[PDB]
Write a protein that binds this ligand. Structure first.
Ligand SMILES: CCCCCCCCCCCCCCCCCC(=O)OC[C@H](COP(=O)([O-])OCC(O)COP(=O)([O-])OC[C@@H](COC(=O)CCCCCCCCCCCCCCCCC)OC(=O)CCCCCCCCCCCCCCCCC)OC(=O)CCCCCCCCCCCCCCCCC
Ligand SMILES: CCCCCCCCCCCCCCCCCC(=O)OC[C@H](COP(=O)([O-])OCC(O)COP(=O)([O-])OC[C@@H](COC(=O)CCCCCCCCCCCCCCCCC)OC(=O)CCCCCCCCCCCCCCCCC)OC(=O)CCCCCCCCCCCCCCCCC
Ligand SMILES: CCCCCCCCCCCCCCCCCC(=O)OC[C@H](COP(=O)([O-])OCC[N+](C)(C)C)OC(=O)CCCCCCCCCCCCCCCCC
Ligand SMILES: CCCCCCCCCCCCCCCCCC(=O)OC[C@H](COP(=O)([O-])OCC[N+](C)(C)C)OC(=O)CCCCCCCCCCCCCCCCC
Ligand SMILES: CCCCCCCCCCCCCCCCCC(=O)OC[C@H](COP(=O)([O-])OCC[N+](C)(C)C)OC(=O)CCCCCCCCCCCCCCCCC
Ligand SMILES: CCCCCCCCCCCCCCCCCC(=O)OC[C@H](COP(=O)([O-])OCC[N+](C)(C)C)OC(=O)CCCCCCCCCCCCCCCCC
Ligand SMILES: CCCCCCCCCCCCCCCCCC(=O)OC[C@H](COP(=O)(O)OCCN)OC(=O)CCCCCCCCCCCCCCCCC
Ligand SMILES: CCCCCCCCCCCCCCCCCC(=O)OC[C@H](COP(=O)(O)OCCN)OC(=O)CCCCCCCCCCCCCCCCC
Ligand SMILES: NC(=O)C1=CN([C@@H]2O[C@H](COP(=O)(O)OP(=O)(O)OC[C@H]3O[C@@H](n4cnc5c(N)ncnc54)[C@H](OP(=O)(O)O)[C@@H]3O)[C@@H](O)[C@H]2O)C=CC1
Ligand SMILES: CCCCCCCCCCCC(=O)OC[C@H](COP(=O)(O)OCC[N+](C)(C)C)OC(=O)CCCCCCCCCCC
Ligand code: SF4
Ligand code: SF4
Ligand code: SF4
Lengths: 49, 176, 155, 342, 318, 45
């Protein structure tokens, strides 16, 4: 049932950020809690998804 | 040819008449409008998450100016004053003299970024690809005096954005 | 130290003001088109708290977008003076900045900062809607650095 | 005054007037007119400020590109003074307060600060210096404001012998505390006056005249090492002057006599304000302090400035205080106040 | 324990009004393919708090041409009467159980119109005056029709008591027997509460801001709070008249749940409509009611005086 | 090499709809009134 998959993708976003503290860091810093495939990082600590 | 947009005559039979009466009294045609907005409520918005997400651009974009160098490090500009002679807004000021080693080089190269119309003519008129417009479009200042660029500020920009300017010129010079 | 407490009241009022900027419905020329596109769905300025209002008395920011002419100069100052303080001015585009393509004309004010005090200057002709949004987000950072209550305390 | 300090142009916004000016206290009432005139003629003005930068925005349209410069300074910091005056050919001091805050007394602001500014200016080789004293300043006053004004007037002369001390009377203008002060007494019904204002004489001067006088001092080499008394053309009894203010504003005038000692007690009450006090014991003293008559000091006329009558330029200040019923009243509608002849 | 009850009424109401601003902005945002406030706090939940503080630390200014005493009375009169409309509302127990509650709400609604007339007149501006006299015109349009629609409904409830509307609808909603009146009542509340397509007194696109173009800072905030308190209050009124919930004396909480949900959906419809239609013209708003609603409302008023008699369905007087 | 330019596909681009398309919806006038009147009678009873 697609409707249950929606919840699972919602929960995989908590575990995708390394836990609850990581989930809230991106929620407040970026107002967006999606999970992407890390393309890479630069010398200043910026991460690219 | 042509076509009439609002040249119609309603059907006056009883069923067609009653359909219009039912629409008038029951507001049916005002409820299609509510259907249209309701569909949009359950669509995904087209918004991006600025500044974490940026709108797409292209190699031809015309942003902040810069002055380039050769791979050696010598300046490309040889003070020909073609960019100055074509600037529609007269935003470029240039002076030149023979350098210590006798090279035709500029002593002054100013761009008034509040007079520039970001038209790109200066880089079209440059025969050595010295003046370009980088891809940067986020250089808002806090004082009017910060937008008057001199040769030091422009040379700094080239050294700051060179890695990207070269990539865009490589991907676009075959159209020029 | 009592200076700490006021330094935390400053954060509150500064946060309330940068979080609820209300620009005036004031555009002049082509730049005002790119100001509409900042209200369009892609950038949706309203999601930063930025909401246009028509009345000068209900506005916090004037976004001078376009050319200012000698015939229009008295009108711009009036609506600015009618904005309650604190008030901020953003100069969008090159006509509003230093005259732009019409600097040397006879009917154009060379720079909107001759008529009003300006905080942020946005370069471009027109500045992309994304460029203007950078200007507004830079204005919020300028309001976050205000220390009105920490300066009153030390008087 | 080398090649870069020679005038050019025709004295406009984009002209070079060969003046480099540091104005302390440029965010005050008198500051915004000195800066306005200096920038009108194309002068490089340095503006050290103590307040929030937002409180200087009004000064930005007053000067051409790159002409008005802002610096963060501190009255008690000797280095910040030097960083701001070291390049100036003239320093103009306008620092002052009408009340004593928890951090600055009248001796801090009218003795210790002006002396420090003058000292560092001389150490930096500043050619000209201008100090704004008060007309009524004297050692034997009952007001700390005027007493400290007298000590400062004496320290500056010692530190900077070539300074041009200026002694304005009460100054009236749009943002004054002189005509707006009386007009705002209406909030309390009556208009208390010590002795009913029949034994106090005032000779106010217009704001622009003080400014035009200051600018003429800068350019006039004969004003070096001299003292001036800027004053209006006419002397009015305080009662007749305050009666005029309520006449122009078209407000009911209900003066009553209040004893000097009781007036101070009220002055003690308002001082509890942690903000700009509405009135203070010190301010009451100044209000009822008769304006001096100094016939030996040079005045405005010696600087080429014609004193502006109060009647001509009083409506512009007080039209704001009238109700809608009387906004459209004209200048001629009120007969001028009674003057004290010489 | 009565003063505690009043505070327990007005204080939540202000909070609901504050967050209705967020809901409208976020709802209109998604119908418009935007996202609405989402940056100020998680999902914008702090957006109302930022706006409220910003307004009250701003500078209020009285225009030079204003009438001071009336200019300040209007916002006080506006918000005070907005919170007054709530005291007799059964939810399921009213704070003040008025025997003539329906008349009381009618009268207070009329009195609240003068907070618009006096604000626009005291401003002493032409856009402020044009908006003031669009409220005179707008009230002349719906006041008579809205009163008669209530009378028609009350001919099936039996009394003006608001709590009796609950008893009347213990077997079935009043929208079924009276759906034609509900349609004309819903549009009347749109017009009465000055809402699009009937938000003519303010008229941003035509009068800059209407009667309140001269109001800023806190004084403006009181008008904004008053306007939204009416939006919630009238939709609570609509739910009680036509969508009457069932009351269980032992579990009054269940009523407040069903009652609140119905009032929310009716309130979302107000936002939904504002994002769907253009604006009437203030002379057409008058012809809509006098030439379409009034002829039909008078006919239905007759039908509801005769229907109970010819069917022996007259309700009890008490 | 040959000349490479931004050109359409060999067979051309597919069709593009451009005419108005407002589908007919809903029941006729008579049916909408029957349900309207029908509800009243039940409501009255
Ligand atoms: C009883 C009254 C007996 C008669 C009073 C005097 C009659 C004068 C007749 C002159 C005339 O024809 O026009 C009226 C006269 C002049 O009218 P106008 O010059 O043609 O037009 C401007 C108006 O004055 C209006 O100008 P305004 O708006 O600037 O006046 C301010 C204030 C009225 O101005 C005042 O006079 C108030 C101050 C008086 C009391 C204070 C006296 C001083 C006592 C010591 C103060 C201690 C302070 C402690 C704190 O008006 C008010 O709103 C206060 C009324 C409050 C009623 C509630 O207006 C008056 O002020 C008279 C009434 C003032 C007393 C209020 C009595 C209210 C009635 C109850
Ligand atoms: C068991 C009991 C239950 C009772 C239940 C019933 C409760 C009563 C129902 C509600 C009653 C509403 C009262 C009527 C509203 C006022 C009417 C009005 O607008 O006249 C203004 C009228 C014009 O003065 P204005 O508006 O200042 O002049 C325009 C200028 O632009 C003025 O420009 P400006 O430069 O002077 O503006 C500056 C000024 C402006 O200050 C203000 O903004 C005033 C703020 C007051 C707000 C009051 C509303 C809250 O700021 C100040 O300096 C403040 C000090 C100056 C005095 C303020 C004058 C106060 C006037 C009286 C209030 O004032 C008068 O002439 C006073 C005459 C007496 C007025 C009452 C006569 C009608 C009687 C109807 C009520 C029946 C009597 C019993 C009521 C009490 C029962 C408890
Ligand atoms: C969120 C949870 C779901 C909520 C339910 C969905 C919201 C429904 C509103 C959108 C409707 C979509 C458009 C539609 O189907 O109707 C258009 C259709 C199309 O209308 P039309 O005008 O194009 O043609 C139909 C009528 N003839 C053919 C005769 C002209 O109209 C209708 O059938 C709606 C009729 C309903 C009228 C009810 C009004 C009275 C209401 C009384 C109180 C209740
Ligand atoms: C719904 C909300 C309704 C209730 C409102 C809730 C508001 C909660 C936030 C409180 C913030 C209070 C500070 C706001 C002060 C406004 C301001 O910035 O003025 C700067 C002023 C100006 O500072 P200044 O005195 O140095 O400047 C004077 C000279 N000028 C203006 C020319 C530069 O500073 C203050 O005086 C504020 C003092 C801080 C204490 C304020 C408390 C006052 C007493 C009430 C308690
Ligand atoms: C400006 C703001 C002015 C205040 C706004 C309110 C205006 C008056 C409202 C009238 C109150 C009322 O009639 O309620 C009916 C309601 C009708 O209730 P009722 O008819 O069901 O009777 C209640 C009691 N039983 C049923 C048991 C008999 O009155 C009450 O509920 C209680 C009445 C108590 C008596 C109160 C008298 C004092 C109130 C009068 C104040 C008048 C001030 C007018 C000022 C207007 C100025 C604009
Ligand atoms: C397009 C805009 C115009 C249309 C706006 C319509 C918005 C109002 C729609 C209200 C729908 C009914 C409320 C459904 C959600 C809450 C239901 C509820 O809590 O109670 C259960 C309700 C019924 O509960 P009840 O308490 O109302 O009892 C039914 C009526 N009596 C009292 C006679 C028994 O069931 C439903 O509404 C489900 C459908
Ligand atoms: C079988 C069932 C049959 C039902 C009865 C059928 C006949 C109904 C006739 C009603 C129409 C009357 C004639 C008419 O159509 O006039 C239309 C006219 C148009 O006016 P308008 O659109 O505003 O602009 C001018 C355009 N020519 O409008 C006018 O100018 C005049 C409009 C008259 C308004 C009448 C208002 C009365 C409304 C209350 C209705 C209840 C009346 C009391 C009941 C009496 C019987 C007991
Ligand atoms: C808020 C109000 C929103 C109303 C939404 C009702 C749903 C409308 C609807 O269903 O229309 C879409 C549907 C299209 O289906 P279809 O007929 O196949 O379209 C192609 C036909 N050639 O068309 C339909 O099937 C119509 C089905 C709904 C019709 C409702 C009956 C008519 C309503 C008039 C009486 C209203 C008052 C009744 C009492 C209400 C009490 C609650
Ligand atoms: N009626 C009059 O106005 C008279 C004027 N004068 C004198 O003219 C001078 C200025 O005129 P006026 O406009 O009336 O004064 P204002 O009160 O209007 O302004 C005072 C200026 O001095 C600054 N100031 C005060 N204290 C300090 C301090 N510790 N550190 C730094 N700056 C300080 C203020 O800076 P900020 O507020 O930004 O912190 C402000 O810019 C005063 O010395 C006054 O005594 C003499 C005769 C009459
Ligand atoms: C109708 C009732 C109110 C009337 C107006 C009076 C209230 C004025 C508010 C400031 C009081 C004051 O002065 O507070 C002073 C205190 C501590 O100052 P301190 O270190 O003890 O002394 C230093 C005194 N300075 C500041 C003059 C140099 O600062 C605070 O933390 C108060 C700021 C928050 C107040 C709540 C908002
Ligand atoms: S982009 Fe156009 S206006 Fe700008 S400097 Fe180049 S030529 Fe001049
Ligand atoms: S056109 Fe190019 S080479 Fe010539 S002056 Fe301009 S930047 Fe230099
Ligand atoms: S700055 Fe550019 S876009 Fe803006 S008004 Fe001028 S020419 Fe038009």
């Amino acid at each position: 049932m697609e409707l249950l998959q929606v919840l699972k993708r919602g929960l995989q976003q908590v575990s995708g950020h390394g836990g609850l503290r990581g989930y809230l860091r991106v929620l407040f810093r970026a107002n967006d809690v999606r999970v992407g495939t890390l393309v890479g990082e630069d010398k200043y600590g910026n991460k690219y998804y | 040819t042509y076509k009439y947009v609002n040249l119609r005559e309603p059907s006056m039979d009883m069923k067609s008449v009653t359909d219009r009466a039912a629409q008038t009294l029951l507001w049916t045609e005002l409820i299609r409008g509510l259907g249209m907005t309701l569909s949009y409520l359950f669509r995904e918005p087209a918004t991006i998450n600025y500044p974490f997400e940026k709108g797409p651009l292209s190699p031809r974009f015309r942003g902040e100016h810069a002055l380039r160098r050769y791979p050696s490090g010598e300046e490309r500009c040889i003070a020909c004053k073609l960019c100055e002679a074509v600037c529609p807004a007269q935003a470029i000021t240039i002076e030149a003299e023979p350098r210590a080693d006798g090279s035709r080089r500029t002593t002054r190269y100013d761009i008034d970024m509040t007079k520039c119309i970001y038209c790109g003519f200066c880089q079209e008129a440059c025969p050595v690809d010295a003046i370009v417009e980088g891809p940067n479009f986020e250089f808002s200042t806090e004082t009017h005096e910060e937008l008057l660029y001199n040769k030091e500020k422009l040379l700094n920009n080239g050294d700051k954005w060179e890695a990207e300017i070269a990539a865009n010129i490589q991907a676009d010079y075959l159209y020029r | 130290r009592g200076e700490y407490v006021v330094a935390k009241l400053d954060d509150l009022i500064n946060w309330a003001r940068r979080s609820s900027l209300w620009p005036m419905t004031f555009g002049l020329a082509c730049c005002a088109v790119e100001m509409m596109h900042m209200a369009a769905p892609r950038y949706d300025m309203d999601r930063f708290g930025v909401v246009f209002r028509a009345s000068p008395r209900q506005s916090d920011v004037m976004i001078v977008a376009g050319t200012l002419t000698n015939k229009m100069a008295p009108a711009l100052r009036k609506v600015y003076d009618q904005m309650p303080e604190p008030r901020y001015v953003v100069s969008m585009g090159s006509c509003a900045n230093g005259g732009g393509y019409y600097h040397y004309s006879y009917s154009v004010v060379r720079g909107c900062d001759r008529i009003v005090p300006v905080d942020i200057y946005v370069p471009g002709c027109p500045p992309t809607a994304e460029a203007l949004l950078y200007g507004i987000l830079q204005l919020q950072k300028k309001i976050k650095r205000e220390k009105r209550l920490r300066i009153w305390y030390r008087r | 005054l080398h090649h870069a300090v020679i005038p050019h142009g025709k004295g406009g916004r984009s002209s070079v007037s060969g003046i480099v000016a540091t104005v302390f206290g440029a965010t005050g009432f008198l500051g915004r007119y000195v800066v306005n005139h200096l920038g009108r003629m194309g002068s490089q003005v340095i503006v050290p400020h103590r307040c929030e930068p937002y409180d200087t925005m009004h000064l930005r349209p007053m000067g051409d590109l790159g002409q008005i410069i802002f610096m963060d300074w501190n009255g008690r910091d000797k280095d910040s003074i030097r960083r701001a005056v070291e390049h100036s050919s003239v320093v103009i001091n306008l620092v002052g307060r009408e009340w004593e805050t928890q951090n600055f007394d009248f001796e801090d602001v009218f003795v210790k600060i002006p002396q420090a500014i003058a000292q560092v200016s001389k150490e930096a080789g500043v050619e000209k210096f201008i100090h704004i004293s008060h007309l009524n300043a004297d050692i034997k006053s009952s007001s700390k404001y005027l007493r400290s004004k007298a000590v400062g007037e004496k320290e500056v002369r010692e530190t900077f012998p070539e300074a041009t001390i200026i002694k304005p009377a009460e100054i009236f203008g749009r943002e004054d505390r002189f005509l707006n002060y009386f007009a705002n007494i209406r909030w309390f019904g009556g208009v208390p006056l010590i002795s009913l204002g029949k034994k106090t004489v005032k000779q106010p001067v217009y704001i622009v005249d003080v400014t035009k006088g200051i600018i003429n001092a800068i350019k006039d080499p004969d004003a070096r090492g001299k003292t001036f008394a800027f004053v209006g053309p006419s002397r009015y009894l305080l009662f007749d002057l305050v009666q005029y203010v309520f006449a122009v504003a078209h407000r009911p005038f209900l003066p009553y006599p209040l004893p000097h000692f009781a007036y101070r007690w009220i002055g003690r009450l308002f001082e509890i304000s942690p903000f700009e006090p509405w009135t203070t014991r010190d301010k009451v003293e100044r209000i009822h302090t008769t304006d001096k008559i100094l016939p030996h000091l040079p005045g405005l006329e010696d600087l080429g400035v014609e004193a502006t009558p109060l009647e001509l330029k009083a409506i512009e200040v007080l039209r704001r205080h009238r109700t809608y019923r009387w906004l459209s009243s004209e200048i001629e509608d009120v007969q001028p106040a009674k003057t004290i002849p010489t | 324990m009565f003063m505690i009850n009043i505070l327990m009424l007005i204080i939540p109401i202000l909070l609901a009004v504050a967050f209705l601003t967020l809901v409208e902005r976020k709802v209109l945002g998604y119908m418009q393919l935007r996202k609405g406030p989402n940056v100020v706090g998680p999902y914008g939940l702090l957006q109302p708090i930022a706006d409220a503080i910003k307004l009250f630390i701003k500078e209020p200014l009285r225009p030079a041409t204003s009438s001071a005493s009336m200019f300040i009375l209007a916002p006080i009169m506006a918000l005070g009467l907005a919170l007054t409309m709530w005291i007799p509302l059964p939810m399921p127990y009213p704070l003040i159980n008025m025997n003539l509650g329906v008349l009381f709400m009618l009268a207070m609604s009329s009195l609240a119109v003068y907070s618009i007339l006096w604000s626009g007149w005291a401003s002493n501006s032409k856009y402020a005056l044009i908006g003031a006299l669009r409220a005179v015109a707008q009230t002349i349009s719906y006041e008579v029709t809205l009163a008669i629609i209530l009378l028609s409904v009350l001919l099936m409830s039996g009394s003006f008591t608001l709590s009796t509307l609950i008893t009347t609808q213990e077997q079935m909603w009043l929208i079924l027997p009276a759906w034609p009146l509900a349609m004309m009542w819903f549009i009347s509340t749109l017009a009465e509460t000055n809402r699009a397509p009937f938000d003519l007194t303010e008229g941003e696109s035509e009068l800059v801001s209407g009667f309140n173009v001269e109001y800023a800072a806190g004084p403006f905030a009181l008008f904004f709070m008053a306007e939204y308190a009416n939006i919630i209050m009238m939709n609570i009124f609509t739910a009680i008249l036509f969508l009457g919930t069932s009351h269980n004396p032992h579990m009054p909480e269940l009523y407040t749940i069903n009652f609140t949900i119905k009032s929310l959906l009716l309130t979302m419809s107000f936002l939904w409509i504002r994002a769907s239609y253009p604006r009437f013209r203030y002379d057409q708003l008058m012809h809509l009611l006098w030439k379409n609603f009034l002829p039909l409302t008078l006919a239905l008023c007759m039908w509801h005086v005769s229907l109970p008699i010819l069917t022996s369905g007259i309700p009890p007087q008490t | 090499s040959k000349v490479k330019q931004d050109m359409p596909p060999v067979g051309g681009y597919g069709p593009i709809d451009y005419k108005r398309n407002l589908p007919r919806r809903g029941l006729s006038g008579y049916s909408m009134f029957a349900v309207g009147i029908g509800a009243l009678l039940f409501g009255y009873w």
